[PDB]
Amino acid sequence: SSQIRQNYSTEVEAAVNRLVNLYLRASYTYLSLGFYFDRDDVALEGVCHFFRELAEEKREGAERLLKMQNQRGGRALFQDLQKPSQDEWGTTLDAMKAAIVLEKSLNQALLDLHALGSAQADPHLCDFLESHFLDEEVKLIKKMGDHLTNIQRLVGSQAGLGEYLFERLTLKH
Amino acid sequence: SSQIRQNYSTEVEAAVNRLVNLYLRASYTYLSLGFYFDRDDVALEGVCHFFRELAEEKREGAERLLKMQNQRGGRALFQDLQKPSQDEWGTTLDAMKAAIVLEKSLNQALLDLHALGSAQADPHLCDFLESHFLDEEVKLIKKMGDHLTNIQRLVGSQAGLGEYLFERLTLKH
Amino acid sequence: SSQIRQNYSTEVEAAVNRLVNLYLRASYTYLSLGFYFDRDDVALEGVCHFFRELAEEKREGAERLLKMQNQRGGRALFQDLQKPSQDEWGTTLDAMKAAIVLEKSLNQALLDLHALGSAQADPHLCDFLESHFLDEEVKLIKKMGDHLTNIQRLVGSQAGLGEYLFERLTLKH
Amino acid sequence: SSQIRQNYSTEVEAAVNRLVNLYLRASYTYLSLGFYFDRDDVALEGVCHFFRELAEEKREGAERLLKMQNQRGGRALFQDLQKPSQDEWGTTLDAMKAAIVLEKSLNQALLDLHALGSAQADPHLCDFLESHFLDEEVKLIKKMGDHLTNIQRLVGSQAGLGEYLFERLTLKH
């Protein structure tokens, strides 16, 4: 039941629902990452705040996709959200590597959906993805790559020292 | 060495580097145009300022392309910048004709790169070019065409008079 | 064609044109340096901003020289701008060493032109160079020497750590 | 009688007095030029104001020289001020040509005095001349050359029309 649907394929509708699941799973992963760094035996609050902000960003992305689904006359369908891949996330370096792997997976899912939009001649969809998602992914992944490089440079030698300094001097408070 | 590169072809990376060279060459051409109109034996300051503003715009375009190259994980490679095609630029009319030829050449290079982006299924690139470059080119070329028409209308008959009036009454101070 | 030229030798006019080329080449070199430090596998943004500011300063110096050329009745002549001497710039230390070598070369070119001005009894030229260029070079070179010393002190031992700390704690954001 | 004179030659003292006479004569010439353009049968007020401003500038230059003469312990000596070379100044073009000839003569007198300062190892004098006079002359002469070119471009054909337009659209009110 929709009186508005136009040029919106069932394939795209389904892929949008899958992307919502991916974004919510990413949000959940970042929630876990954030709280891990808030453990009293980890205690790197700049890292807590970095991942918590990302958890909010991914939730907002899911909600944007859902708003779009309804604007086009598609129907939201939700699936179980699988728990994050790890319970403990290791070092800041380990975490930032996991985060980049995650973002690349989201980016590829966006690219896949854009390709589907192109195949389906759905310019509203393809533009929607670029404006709210594809640009943001490129920016985020560059930031994460920058952070990885700085973390790596700081290892040495004296990993504890480097981990503290990165959190204090790069990450925001 | 990049930990971020995704869906960014070597072909696109190379074409972006070439486009940077084209934008810097255009900036250099406009620098020459601007100072020519500041000669005491030319002395058309509205024309100086018009071309100097364009020199800044083209430099900014090059820097935007370079920022994008790094955001995608490509590697900037710079080449020699060839000197402008002329040392003396003739009349305002001659100059404006040269400027339009230049802008059309930049526009075609942007269109060529967009086509490559399309062939390579690189929507981030294609959107980047449209947002920061393709729209601006259309606007600029329309402005230049408008100016050419006004300059042409003012020739007569009394070319000196017309050249002065255009600079005084159309171009900004 | 000039109705204004007075006490301005052909030798000085030519040397001013050469100096414009040197300043533009320096600007181009700093543009390359800046973007190298913005690479995701380098990621030292304080260093990016340091060199980008210098690129702007050198471009402004070229434009000042060109304005002066026209004020004196000389004629700007532009030459090809050779690409920077390197595509990759190594460490912050390597880069700062290259920058000092570059500035000393500009300074010597200014000194050479001042000497020519003196030989030609051209006090407007000699004063112009001192006011806008010679003072600024001394200040800049002292700053670079200061930075080199601080970078060198930070090597150790733990070069990665030192490189990060210099960028965080000395260079501006 | 002076208790302050140091490194200030009689040659320089005399040349400064001569330069005062030249500046006052220039001021007087511009006073005549200004009022000529205020004649009801000439009536080009932008031109009146242009020359009257120059009359003030030249008077101020004379006073600066006189202040300097006393600061150095030299003694002002005034001579008769010869009347301007013409009673009627022809067209704006004629006037602007006369003005440039006048400024070049002042500039050469400044250059001559700077050379004397150099020969006499009098750096206070040479710097004084550059700061307050040599820079200002270059700027003024460039402005006059610019105006001459614009006036010349406007002749045609229709000289009356061009003369009116220059006064209305270039000169200030």
Side-chain angles (χ1 to χ4, degrees), chain B residues 140-166:
Chain B
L140 181 55
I141 293 167
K142 173 61 164 64
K143 180 169 286 303
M144 290 182 172
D146 290 351
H147 288 169
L148 270 183
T149 290
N150 281 100
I151 294 162
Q152 289 162 153
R153 193 163 25 231
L154 281 162
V155 178
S157 217
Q158 328 211 118
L161 175 61
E163 192 161 22
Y164 177 77
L165 286 171
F166 182 75

Side-chain angles (χ1 to χ4, degrees), chain B residues 97-110:
Chain B
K97 285 174 180 171
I100 290 185
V101 169
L102 180 52
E103 291 304 323
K104 288 174 165 177
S105 81
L106 291 180
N107 199 215
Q108 188 56 240
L110 294 162

Side-chain angles (χ1 to χ4, degrees), chain A:
Chain A
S1 181
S2 166
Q3 291 168 316
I4 69 177
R5 194 175 183 147
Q6 187 172 207
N7 193 220
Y8 195 63
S9 69
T10 57
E11 287 88 357
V12 166
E13 173 183 20
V16 167
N17 283 150
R18 281 190 298 271
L19 195 58
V20 168
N21 192 85
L22 293 184
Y23 268 75
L24 293 175
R25 208 233 160 148
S27 184
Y28 201 17
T29 292
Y30 288 129
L31 182 71
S32 176
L33 274 156
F35 280 101
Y36 168 77
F37 288 93
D38 177 56
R39 285 170 50 158
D40 75 89
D41 63 347
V42 177
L44 290 163
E45 291 294 331
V47 189
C48 164
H49 320 325
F50 179 78
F51 290 126
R52 286 285 306 277
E53 165 65 20
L54 288 178
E56 314 316 315
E57 292 183 16
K58 299 305 178 194
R59 185 200 36 91
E60 287 166 4
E63 290 158 1
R64 200 171 299 260
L65 286 160
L66 288 162
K67 185 170 190 163
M68 183 273 290
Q69 180 83 106
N70 277 347
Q71 287 174 317
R72 292 301 300 278
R75 294 294 174 248
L77 284 173
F78 295 99
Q79 301 300 337
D80 301 326
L81 288 191
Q82 277 27 275
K83 73 177 183 179
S85 64
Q86 296 169 222
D87 296 323
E88 297 179 308
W89 298 96
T91 62
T92 304
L93 179 54
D94 293 326
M96 197 65 69
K97 285 174 180 171
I100 290 185
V101 169
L102 180 52
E103 291 304 323
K104 288 174 165 177
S105 81
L106 291 180
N107 199 215
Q108 188 56 240
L110 294 162
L111 291 169
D112 290 348
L113 182 55
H114 194 281
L116 180 59
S118 185
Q120 291 290 335
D122 190 344
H124 184 270
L125 186 270
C126 100
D127 171 69
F128 167 89
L129 292 174
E130 188 63 49
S131 184
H132 299 113
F133 295 87
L134 288 158
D135 301 339
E136 287 307 311
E137 282 306 305
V138 162
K139 287 189 264 210
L140 181 55
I141 293 167
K142 173 61 164 64
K143 180 169 286 303
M144 290 182 172
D146 290 351
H147 288 169
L148 270 183
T149 290
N150 281 100
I151 294 162
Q152 289 162 153
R153 193 163 25 231
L154 281 162
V155 178
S157 217
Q158 328 211 118
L161 175 61
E163 192 161 22
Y164 177 77
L165 286 171
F166 182 75
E167 182 266 339
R168 289 287 92 183
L169 299 184
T170 292
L171 301 174
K172 78 167 84 287
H173 312 91

Side-chain angles (χ1 to χ4, degrees), chain B residues 38 40 42-43 158 164 168, chain D residues 142 149-150 153 157 169-170:
Chain B
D38 177 56
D40 75 89
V42 177
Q158 328 211 118
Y164 177 77
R168 289 287 92 183
Chain D
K142 173 61 164 64
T149 290
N150 281 100
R153 193 163 25 231
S157 217
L169 299 184
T170 292

Side-chain angles (χ1 to χ4, degrees), chain C residues 97-165:
Chain C
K97 285 174 180 171
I100 290 185
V101 169
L102 180 52
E103 291 304 323
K104 288 174 165 177
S105 81
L106 291 180
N107 199 215
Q108 188 56 240
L110 294 162
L111 291 169
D112 290 348
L113 182 55
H114 194 281
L116 180 59
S118 185
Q120 291 290 335
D122 190 344
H124 184 270
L125 186 270
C126 100
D127 171 69
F128 167 89
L129 292 174
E130 188 63 49
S131 184
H132 299 113
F133 295 87
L134 288 158
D135 301 339
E136 287 307 311
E137 282 306 305
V138 162
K139 287 189 264 210
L140 181 55
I141 293 167
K142 173 61 164 64
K143 180 169 286 303
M144 290 182 172
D146 290 351
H147 288 169
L148 270 183
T149 290
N150 281 100
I151 294 162
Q152 289 162 153
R153 193 163 25 231
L154 281 162
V155 178
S157 217
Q158 328 211 118
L161 175 61
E163 192 161 22
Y164 177 77
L165 286 171

